[PDB]
Amino acid sequence: EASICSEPKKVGRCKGYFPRFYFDSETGKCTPFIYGGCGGNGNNFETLHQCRAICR
Ligand SMILES: [Cl-]
Ligand SMILES: [Cl-]
Ligand SMILES: [Cl-]
């Protein structure tokens, strides 16, 4: 529903290269990260716009 915004940043154990956005609780800003390709959670957005639309 949108408790996804409060889930922590999760890179996962995989070593792939997937640039994504998570909403950072501390800063209040949608922040880039390299997601590994497996085992992520809900705080993982494909675009900056998507993250801001949902979380802000
Ligand atoms: Cl992690
Ligand atoms: Cl294992
Ligand atoms: Cl935007």
Short mmCIF file of N, CA and C and ligand atoms in Angstrom, two decimals:
data_model
loop_
_atom_site.label_atom_id
_atom_site.label_comp_id
_atom_site.label_asym_id
_atom_site.label_seq_id
_atom_site.Cartn_x
_atom_site.Cartn_y
_atom_site.Cartn_z
N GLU A 1 0.80 -1.25 0.00
CA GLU A 1 0.00 0.00 0.00
C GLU A 1 0.84 1.31 0.00
N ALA A 2 1.86 1.44 0.86
CA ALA A 2 2.76 2.65 0.91
C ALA A 2 3.52 2.82 2.23
N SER A 3 3.41 1.78 3.05
CA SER A 3 4.41 1.44 4.04
C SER A 3 5.71 1.00 3.34
N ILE A 4 5.66 0.78 2.02
CA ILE A 4 6.85 0.46 1.23
C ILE A 4 7.91 1.55 1.33
N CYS A 5 7.48 2.80 1.49
CA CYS A 5 8.37 3.95 1.61
C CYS A 5 9.19 3.93 2.89
N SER A 6 8.67 3.24 3.90
CA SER A 6 9.37 3.17 5.17
C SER A 6 10.20 1.91 5.34
N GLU A 7 10.19 1.02 4.35
CA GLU A 7 11.03 -0.17 4.35
C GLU A 7 12.50 0.21 4.14
N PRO A 8 13.44 -0.54 4.73
CA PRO A 8 14.80 -0.07 4.56
C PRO A 8 15.39 -0.37 3.19
N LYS A 9 16.40 0.42 2.82
CA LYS A 9 17.25 0.17 1.66
C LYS A 9 17.78 -1.24 1.73
N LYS A 10 17.56 -2.02 0.68
CA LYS A 10 18.02 -3.40 0.64
C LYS A 10 18.69 -3.70 -0.71
N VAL A 11 20.02 -3.81 -0.68
CA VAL A 11 20.83 -4.14 -1.84
C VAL A 11 20.67 -5.61 -2.27
N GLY A 12 20.51 -6.51 -1.29
CA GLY A 12 20.43 -7.94 -1.54
C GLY A 12 21.82 -8.59 -1.62
N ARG A 13 21.83 -9.91 -1.73
CA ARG A 13 23.10 -10.64 -1.78
C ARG A 13 23.61 -10.86 -3.20
N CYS A 14 22.81 -10.48 -4.20
CA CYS A 14 23.16 -10.68 -5.60
C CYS A 14 24.11 -9.59 -6.09
N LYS A 15 24.85 -9.87 -7.16
CA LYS A 15 25.95 -9.00 -7.58
C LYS A 15 25.66 -8.33 -8.92
N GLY A 16 24.39 -8.26 -9.30
CA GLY A 16 24.01 -7.65 -10.55
C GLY A 16 24.08 -6.15 -10.48
N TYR A 17 23.79 -5.50 -11.59
CA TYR A 17 23.80 -4.04 -11.67
C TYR A 17 22.46 -3.45 -12.10
N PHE A 18 21.65 -3.02 -11.13
CA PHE A 18 20.33 -2.43 -11.36
C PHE A 18 20.21 -1.12 -10.61
N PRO A 19 20.51 0.01 -11.28
CA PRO A 19 20.26 1.29 -10.62
C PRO A 19 18.78 1.55 -10.32
N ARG A 20 18.50 1.85 -9.05
CA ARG A 20 17.16 2.04 -8.56
C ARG A 20 17.11 3.24 -7.60
N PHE A 21 15.91 3.57 -7.14
CA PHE A 21 15.71 4.59 -6.12
C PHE A 21 15.01 4.03 -4.89
N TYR A 22 15.47 4.45 -3.72
CA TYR A 22 14.76 4.22 -2.48
C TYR A 22 14.49 5.57 -1.84
N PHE A 23 13.43 5.65 -1.05
CA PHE A 23 13.13 6.84 -0.30
C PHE A 23 13.87 6.77 1.02
N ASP A 24 14.70 7.77 1.28
CA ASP A 24 15.48 7.82 2.51
C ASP A 24 14.75 8.58 3.61
N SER A 25 14.43 7.86 4.69
CA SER A 25 13.77 8.41 5.89
C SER A 25 14.49 9.60 6.54
N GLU A 26 15.79 9.44 6.74
CA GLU A 26 16.66 10.45 7.33
C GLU A 26 16.64 11.78 6.56
N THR A 27 16.91 11.73 5.25
CA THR A 27 17.00 12.92 4.40
C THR A 27 15.68 13.40 3.79
N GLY A 28 14.70 12.52 3.68
CA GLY A 28 13.44 12.88 3.05
C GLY A 28 13.55 12.93 1.54
N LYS A 29 14.62 12.35 0.99
CA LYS A 29 14.87 12.43 -0.45
C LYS A 29 15.00 11.06 -1.12
N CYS A 30 14.41 10.94 -2.31
CA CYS A 30 14.57 9.76 -3.15
C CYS A 30 16.02 9.69 -3.60
N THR A 31 16.66 8.57 -3.33
CA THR A 31 18.10 8.46 -3.39
C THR A 31 18.48 7.27 -4.25
N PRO A 32 19.44 7.45 -5.20
CA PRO A 32 19.92 6.36 -6.04
C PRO A 32 20.70 5.30 -5.27
N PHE A 33 20.60 4.06 -5.74
CA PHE A 33 21.40 2.96 -5.24
C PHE A 33 21.50 1.85 -6.28
N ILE A 34 22.50 1.01 -6.13
CA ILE A 34 22.68 -0.12 -7.00
C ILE A 34 22.11 -1.36 -6.31
N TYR A 35 20.99 -1.81 -6.84
CA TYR A 35 20.33 -3.00 -6.38
C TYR A 35 20.98 -4.20 -7.06
N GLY A 36 21.13 -5.31 -6.33
CA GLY A 36 21.86 -6.47 -6.84
C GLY A 36 21.11 -7.43 -7.75
N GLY A 37 19.79 -7.37 -7.74
CA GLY A 37 18.99 -8.23 -8.62
C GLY A 37 18.15 -9.30 -7.94
N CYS A 38 18.28 -9.46 -6.62
CA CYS A 38 17.47 -10.43 -5.89
C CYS A 38 17.28 -9.99 -4.46
N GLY A 39 16.18 -10.45 -3.86
CA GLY A 39 15.98 -10.27 -2.42
C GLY A 39 15.68 -8.87 -1.94
N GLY A 40 15.26 -7.98 -2.83
CA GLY A 40 14.91 -6.63 -2.41
C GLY A 40 13.55 -6.57 -1.73
N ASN A 41 13.16 -5.38 -1.28
CA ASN A 41 11.85 -5.13 -0.70
C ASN A 41 11.07 -4.06 -1.48
N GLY A 42 10.08 -3.45 -0.82
CA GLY A 42 9.16 -2.51 -1.46
C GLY A 42 9.71 -1.13 -1.74
N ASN A 43 10.76 -0.75 -1.02
CA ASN A 43 11.43 0.54 -1.18
C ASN A 43 12.50 0.47 -2.27
N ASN A 44 12.03 0.40 -3.50
CA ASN A 44 12.86 0.05 -4.63
C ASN A 44 12.03 0.50 -5.79
N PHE A 45 12.44 1.60 -6.42
CA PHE A 45 11.70 2.19 -7.50
C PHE A 45 12.55 2.29 -8.75
N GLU A 46 11.90 2.13 -9.89
CA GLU A 46 12.58 2.12 -11.15
C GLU A 46 13.06 3.49 -11.59
N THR A 47 12.31 4.54 -11.23
CA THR A 47 12.62 5.90 -11.64
C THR A 47 12.54 6.86 -10.46
N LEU A 48 13.21 8.01 -10.59
CA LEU A 48 13.13 9.11 -9.65
C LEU A 48 11.70 9.62 -9.55
N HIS A 49 11.03 9.70 -10.69
CA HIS A 49 9.67 10.18 -10.70
C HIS A 49 8.72 9.25 -9.93
N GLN A 50 8.85 7.95 -10.14
CA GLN A 50 8.06 6.94 -9.45
C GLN A 50 8.22 7.04 -7.93
N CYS A 51 9.45 7.12 -7.46
CA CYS A 51 9.73 7.29 -6.05
C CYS A 51 9.09 8.54 -5.47
N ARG A 52 9.16 9.65 -6.18
CA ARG A 52 8.61 10.90 -5.65
C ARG A 52 7.10 10.84 -5.71
N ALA A 53 6.54 10.36 -6.82
CA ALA A 53 5.10 10.20 -6.92
C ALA A 53 4.55 9.37 -5.76
N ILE A 54 5.12 8.20 -5.50
CA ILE A 54 4.64 7.34 -4.41
C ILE A 54 5.00 7.86 -3.01
N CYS A 55 6.23 8.32 -2.80
CA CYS A 55 6.69 8.51 -1.42
C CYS A 55 6.65 9.92 -0.85
N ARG A 56 6.41 10.91 -1.69
CA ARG A 56 6.60 12.30 -1.31
C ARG A 56 5.35 13.15 -1.56
CL CL B 1 21.65 -5.26 2.53
CL CL B 2 22.62 -19.35 1.51
CL CL B 3 9.97 14.28 -10.88
#
